[PDB]
């Protein structure tokens, strides 16, 4: 059966409004996966996001109009063939990328089936999915920040003391030869 023009408009409007508030939109090829798999992926997502994340297979035409109206650009390359969409409306989005990345891995699926998307308003490619998926926890990040911020000072001491080490290194070298 055909959908009324009004029914279609409502679906497009709803989707468009959702994409206007999401912090992540990732496009995935979910062909071949079973309902059991869908159920498991959704469960892994919910355990971490509750209702803040969704994973739904959505017809390309619908996705296109919704993205178009939400004012997105350069997404057409992500809608070639049946495509499912993973989006986050509440909570930090990084963990959802990790979840679906590790799910495809557990299922032994081609990781290129994770086509790319938009993260916090920034477009990312398929190859970049791995980058996001492997990001360390926020806590680990905060920890690393301190040493990164101290680098200049750390580098100064290392450079000055390195002048003395060069003498030691070359003397050892001369001893090495013999």
């Amino acid at each position: 059966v055909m959908l009324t023009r009004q029914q279609k408009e409502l679906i497009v409007k709803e989707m468009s409004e959702i994409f206007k508030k999401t912090s992540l939109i990732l496009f995935a090829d979910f062909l071949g996966f079973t309902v059991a798999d869908l159920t498991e992926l959704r469960s892994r997502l919910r355990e971490k996001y509750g209702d803040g994340a969704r994973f739904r297979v959505v017809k390309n035409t619908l996705l296109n109009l919704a993205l178009k109206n939400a004012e997105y650009e350069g997404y057409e390359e992500f809608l070639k063939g049946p495509t499912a969409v993973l989006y986050v409306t509440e909570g930090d989005p990084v963990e959802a990328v990790k979840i679906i990345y590790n799910f495809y891995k557990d299922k032994k699926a081609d990781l290129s089936r994770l086509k790319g998307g938009f993260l916090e308003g920034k477009k990312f490619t398929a190859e970049e999915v791995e980058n996001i998926a492997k990001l360390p926890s926020k806590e680990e990040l905060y920890a690393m920040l301190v040493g990164r911020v101290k680098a200049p000072i750390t580098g100064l001491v290392f450079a000055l003391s390195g002048i003395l080490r060069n003498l030691v290194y070359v003397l050892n070298a001369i001893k090495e030869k013999k």
């Binding site: 200049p152 100064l156 450079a159 000055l160 390195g162 002048i163 060069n166």
Partner: peptide, 29 residues
Amino acid sequence: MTIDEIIEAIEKLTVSELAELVKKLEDKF
């Protein structure tokens, strides 16, 4: 150009300048 005066001069550099000083030290030594 005393040891303490060198340290004082370094503390007064901006972080951008410090990074450059480090690069110069590495290049030279």
